Every structure is written in structure tokens, then in C-alpha cells.
Amino acid sequence: SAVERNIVSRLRDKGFAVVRAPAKDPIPDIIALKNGVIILIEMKSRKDIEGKIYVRREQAEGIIEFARKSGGSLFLGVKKPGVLKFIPFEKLRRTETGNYVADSEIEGLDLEDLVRLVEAKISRTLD
């Protein structure tokens, strides 16, 4: 919420047209658009007792479907102390039940790494 408004504000300053999903089918929390590049950021997640991050099957599938249909890149936003990290959703492990977990090995991207991937996609589209 304060985290969401902060990401939104920072993506808007970076020239993105940003929309926060309103409150049946799940829509990623943040939709950021810049010159044909669609970035989808999921801020909601669950944690196990140990801190293993996961997204339940139905939530995950809904946002994956939103991503798949939109042609946008989906990320799971992870709250760290004073920083946000973004895991490409394809880096999460799908469990036999269909839940998506962020394994400990997981390399998170910072907002700046995301914007750089966006600027790179923008440059690949012209070329």
C-alpha cells in the first residue's frame, strides 16, 4: 500500500503509465506500461513459517493468465528491509499442487533492473 504507492510513484517518474488494480479473476496489483512494454507486478504473496514465499495456485494462475494474454512480463514483488525486489514469475518454482514458490536460491531484481529490462525491450522492438 505505502509500498505500492512508492513503486507506482517511482515507475511514473521513470516515464511509465501506471495503473493499480482495483479492489472474480485476479489482476496483478500494478500494471506499468511504457512504449509498448507491459510490466505486471504482483505485490501480494504468502510466506511459510520459515519465510519461503509462495503464491497459491488460483491467484498465481490468474495473474499468469493476465500476463500471458496481455503479453506482459510478470514479477512478484518481495518486501525486503527498505528495499523491494522483483522476481520474474517464470523464476518461481511451480509445485505439484500448482503453487508457485520463491526458492532461497532466487535472485531478485531491483526496480532499476526492471526499468533497464524495459528500456532494453523498447530498443529490441525498433531493431
Add this chain to the structure above:
Amino acid sequence: SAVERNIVSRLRDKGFAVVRAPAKDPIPDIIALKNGVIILIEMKSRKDIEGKIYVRREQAEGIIEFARKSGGSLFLGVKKPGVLKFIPFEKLRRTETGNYVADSEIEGLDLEDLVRLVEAKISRTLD
């Protein structure tokens, strides 16, 4: 509102990832994404002395800016009896006051014509 929910439902049936702008630097009412194609639909408008649909300067400029930033195609949705028409925002006439009006001549697209333009843009991207 009932019109908005209807467009959303129809675009979702057509394979679009759709988000309604929440309840400000403006966000178009409807954002529909399909395979890299960004469609922005403005439903809110006013009627002038001649019964012509228009968008006020500040609202228009904000949604035009959202479209420029996002790389999406902006449309003004016009409620006709029993039908919805979509005018590409670039077809609207900018008045002396900076308002954007839909001239009588400009016959918009129906939702199906929009989807066809989207499917065509999707096919041009592969080729």
C-alpha cells in the same frame, strides 16, 4: 458503468487482459491488453450544444499523455442507441479551448472493428 462492465466482459471474452481504472493525472476508464497491443478506452464524455460528444481539455490531455507514455491506442467510447462506437482519439477535433470533440461525420468503430485492428497489429508484429 453497465456499459463499462459490458465492454470489459466482451474484451475479456476476446482474450484481452482488461483492467478498469480505479476511482488525479488521468487514467483511461478501460485498459485492455492483448499480446503486446495496448488499447485504451475513455468512456466518460460530455455533450455540446449540437449533441456532439467531447472530452474536456485537462481530462483529454491526461489520457493522451497516458496513451503517449504507454504506447497504447486511445479511443473515445460513444454510447449510441443499442450500440457502442469507438473513435480513435486522433480523429477528434481539438477546439480553441483545448477540448476534443467527435464531429458528426466521424463514424467510429464497433468493438469488433477494434478487436480486428488488434488482431491485425498482433499479426504485423510476427511479420
